[PDB]
Paper text:
As part of the RIKEN Structural Genomics Initiative (RSGI) project, in collaboration with UK Structural Genomics, we selected the hypothetical protein GK0453 (13 kDa, 113 residues) from Geo­bacillus kaustophilus HTA426 to predict its function from analysis of its crystal structure. In conclusion, the crystal structure of the hypothetical protein GK0453 revealed two small domains: a helix–turn–helix motif at the N-terminal region and an SH3-like β-barrel structure at the C-­terminal region.
The crystal structure of a conserved hypothetical protein, GK0453, from Geobacillus kaustophilus has been determined to 2.2 Å resolution. The crystal belonged to space group P43212, with unit-cell parameters a = b = 75.69, c = 64.18 Å. The N-terminal region contains a helix–turn–helix motif (α1, Lys14–Met34; α2, Val37–Tyr53). The C-terminal domain possesses a β-­barrel-like structure with four β-strands (β1, Glu64–Ile68; β2, Ala71–Lys82; β3, Phe85–Arg90; β4, Glu98–Pro101). The domain bearing these residues, which are responsible for recognizing the methylated histone tail, is absent in GK0453; however, the GK0453 and MRG15 chromodomain structures both possess similar hydrophobic environments. However, the structural analysis suggested that the β-barrel domain of GK0453 may also be involved in protein–protein interactions with an unknown function.
Author numbering: 5 to 108
Write the structure that this text describes.
């Protein structure tokens, strides 16, 4: 029965991502925009657990993966999350999976 992403090995995370990727693909062909975005969030989360939170630092600003020209300013890290805010948007704080920050 389903393991949480935080308990999976790399091999399990990769298999979960492959499965989610195929559903995301069909959702896209069918035009199920909301279902597609749900699968993409899960994929981002699974990817985050294959990255190193240490590569990210408070005060640093990063390009946002899947969104050219947009940047995120990191206030602080927690687990596989970076809390901070998008520059081009409102100063509202937001938690973003580290997989959505373009590596150094």
């Amino acid at each position: 029965e389903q393991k949480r992403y935080s308990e999976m090995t790399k091999e399990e995370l990769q298999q979960e991502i492959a499965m989610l990727t195929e559903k995301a693909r069909k959702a896209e062909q069918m035009g199920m925009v909301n279902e597609y975005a749900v699968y993409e969030r899960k994929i981002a989360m699974a990817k985050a657990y294959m990255l190193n939170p240490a590569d990210f630092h408070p005060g640093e600003i990063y390009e946002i993966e899947g969104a050219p020209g947009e940047y995120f300013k990191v206030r602080y890290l927690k687990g596989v999350f970076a809390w901070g805010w998008r520059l081009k948007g409102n100063g509202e704080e937001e938690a973003l999976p580290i997989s959505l920050l373009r590596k150094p």
